[PDB]
Amino acid sequence: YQLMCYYTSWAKDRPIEGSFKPGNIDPCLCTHLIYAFAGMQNNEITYTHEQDLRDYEALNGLKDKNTELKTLLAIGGWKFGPAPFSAMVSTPQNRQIFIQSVIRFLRQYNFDGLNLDWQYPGSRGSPPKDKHLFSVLVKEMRKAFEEESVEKDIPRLLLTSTGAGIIDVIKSGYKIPELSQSLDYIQVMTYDLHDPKDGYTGENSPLYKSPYDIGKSADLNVDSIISYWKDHGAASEKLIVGFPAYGHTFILSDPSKTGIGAPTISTGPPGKYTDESGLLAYYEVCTFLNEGATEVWDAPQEVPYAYQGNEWVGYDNVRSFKLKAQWLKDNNLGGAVVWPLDMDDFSGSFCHQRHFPLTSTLKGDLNIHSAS
Ligand SMILES: N[C@@H]1[C@@H](O)[C@H](O)[C@@H](CO)O[C@H]1O
CATH number of the domain where residue 309 is located: 3.10.50.10
* CA–CA separation, 21 and 247 (whole Å): 22
- How far apart are the CA of 91 and the centre of ligand 1, in A? 26
Q: HSE of 354 in the Cβ direction (CA atoms, 13 Å)?
A: 7
Residues 138 and 98 occupy one common structural domain: yes
* CA angle, 15 then 8 then 285, to 5°: 60
Q: Where among 315, 335, 357 does a domain terminate?
A: 315
From 35, 40, 117, the mutation candidate for ligand 1 (largest count of ligand atoms within 8 A of CB) is: 117
Strands 311-314 and 239-244, sheet pairing: unpaired
Residues 256 and 145 occupy one common structural domain: no
Q: Ligand 1: which residue has its CA nearest to atom 3? A: 77
- How far apart are the CA of 339 and the centre of ligand 1, in A? 8
The count of domains in the chain is: 2
Q: List the determination method.
A: X-ray
* CA–CA separation, 106 and 111 (whole Å): 5
Does the annotation list 32 as a binding residue? Answer: no
Residues 238 and 124 occupy one common structural domain: yes
Q: Ligand 1: which residue has its CA nearest to atom 1? A: 77
* CA–CA separation, 181 and 105 (whole Å): 25
- How far apart are the CA of 165 and the centre of ligand 1, in A? 11
- How far apart are the CA of 77 and the centre of ligand 1, in A? 5
Q: For residue 57, give Cα distances in angstroms to 22, 51, 60, 110.
A: 9, 11, 5, 8
Given a contact cutoff of 8 angstroms between Cβ atoms, the answer to whether 126 and 120 are in contact is yes
* CA–CA separation, 205 and 226 (whole Å): 12
Give resolution in angstroms: 2.5
Q: Which helix (H) or strand (E) holds 118?
A: strand 113-118
What own/partner pairs with CB < 8 Å and gap ≥ 24 does 326-332 have? Answer: 326/365, 327/207, 327/222, 327/223, 328/1, 328/241, 328/366, 330/226, 330/236, 331/236, 331/237, 332/226, 332/236, 332/239, 332/241
One-letter amino acid of 72 = L
Who lines ligand 1 at CB under 6 A?
Answer: 6, 74, 76-78, 117, 119, 162, 189, 192, 339
Residues 101 and 175 occupy one common structural domain: yes
Q: Ligand 1: which residue has its CA nearest to atom 11? A: 77
